[PDB]
Amino acid sequence: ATYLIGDVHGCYDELIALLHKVEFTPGKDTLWLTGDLVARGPGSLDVLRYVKSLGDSVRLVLGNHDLHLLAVFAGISRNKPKDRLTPLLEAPDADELLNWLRRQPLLQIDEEKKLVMAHAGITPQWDLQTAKECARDVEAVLSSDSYPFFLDAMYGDMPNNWSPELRGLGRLRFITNAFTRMRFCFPNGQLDMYSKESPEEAPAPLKPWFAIPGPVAEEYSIAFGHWASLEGKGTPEGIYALDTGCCWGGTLTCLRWEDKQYFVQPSNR
Numbered sequence: 001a002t003y004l005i006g007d008v009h010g011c012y013d014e015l016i017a018l019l020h021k022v023e024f025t026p027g028k029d030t031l032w033l034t035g036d037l038v039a040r041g042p043g044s045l046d047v048l049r050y051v052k053s054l055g056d057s058v059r060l061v062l063g064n065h066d067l068h069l070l071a072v073f074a075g076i077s078r079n080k081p082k083d084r085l086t087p088l089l090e091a092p093d094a095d096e097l098l099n100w101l102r103r104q105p106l107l108q109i110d111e112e113k114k115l116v117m118a119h120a121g122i123t124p125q126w127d128l129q130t131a132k133e134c135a136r137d138v139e140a141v142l143s144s145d146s147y148p149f150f151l152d153a154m155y156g157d158m159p160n161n162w163s164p165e166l167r168g169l170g171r172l173r174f175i176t177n178a179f180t181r182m183r184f185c186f187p188n189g190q191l192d193m194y195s196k197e198s199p200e201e202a203p204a205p206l207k208p209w210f211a212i213p214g215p216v217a218e219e220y221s222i223a224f225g226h227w228a229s230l231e232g233k234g235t236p237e238g239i240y241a242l243d244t245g246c247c248w249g250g251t252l253t254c255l256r257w258e259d260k261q262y263f264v265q266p267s268n269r
């Protein structure tokens with residue numbers, strides 16, 4: 001079977017309890033994870049160890065907190081105590097774990113399931129081929145010996161409008177924001193980088209990225225995490241918001257793809 005789980009955020013105990021509830025069996029089952037495996041919850045170290053150990057039985061996409069962790073590890077960004085990353089950063093296998101983490105995709109595609117996963121979703125300004133190329137471009141930088149320079153460049157909120165003409169720093173920053181930070185769009189598809197509230201509490205004319213018809217969403221289902229204030233609710237058919245805020249005292253949600261059945265694990269917090 002195929003299981004999809006939203007943002008874990010170091011909530012290792014809840015992740016394992018949820019997987020035991022469905023009797024997840026590597027080799028027979030496959031787990032998809034929407035990213036943000038680390039930070040806020042207490043068990044980032046254990047989560048990375050476990051997910052890395054799954055090998056081909058897990059399909060991960062990186063989120064914004066995974067990238068921030070990489071930036072801290074490389075000395076590009078300062079550690080925040082509230083992220084609770086020190087045990088992971090100080091672990092004897094930190095290098096092995098983070099060098100594995102930075103080689104993971106930004107985007108997962110399964111044609112037989114007609115299923116696409118990214119941390120924040122797929123901007124309506126992208127078709128599938130563009131999304132694939134952009135993912136490949138950023139993944140190439142992250143898996144290279146020079147990834148600290150990319151991480152340092154990634155921070156920034158502009159440009160917020162896609163063009164095949166974008167080059168250099170602006171192109172990479174847009175790709176990163178689209179994959180790992182996007183929530184709301186302007187009517188033309190342009191990204192807003194400030195509102196993090198629920199669709200009902202947002203100011204006009206902002207709309208959820210998934211409320212704007214885009215070519216990927218017309219052909220494929222899309223699963224994503226990231227947007228906790230959405231609470232996994234209010235999406236159209238074919239759009240699956242899996243982040244229900246476990247690390248915030250909400251729940252960890254698992255979706256079995258074959259029957260679209262939900263399984264939920266309450267936060268221990």
Ligand SMILES: Nc1ncnc2c1ncn2[C@@H]1O[C@H](COP(=O)(O)OP(=O)(O)O)[C@@H](O)[C@H]1O
Pocket residue numbers: 064065196197198226227228229230231245248250
């Ligand atoms: N259920 C919720 N309702 C409203 N806001 C929430 C909810 N859960 C989390 N938030 C808020 O969402 C804001 C952004 O958190 P999050 O969605 O995890 O994304 P980010 O990676 O940008 O931090 C946080 O400041 C948090 O207070």
Ligand SMILES: [Mn+2]
Pocket residue numbers: 036063064065119180225226227
């Ligand atoms: Mn996120």
Ligand SMILES: [Mn+2]
Pocket residue numbers: 007009036063065226227243
């Ligand atoms: Mn998150």
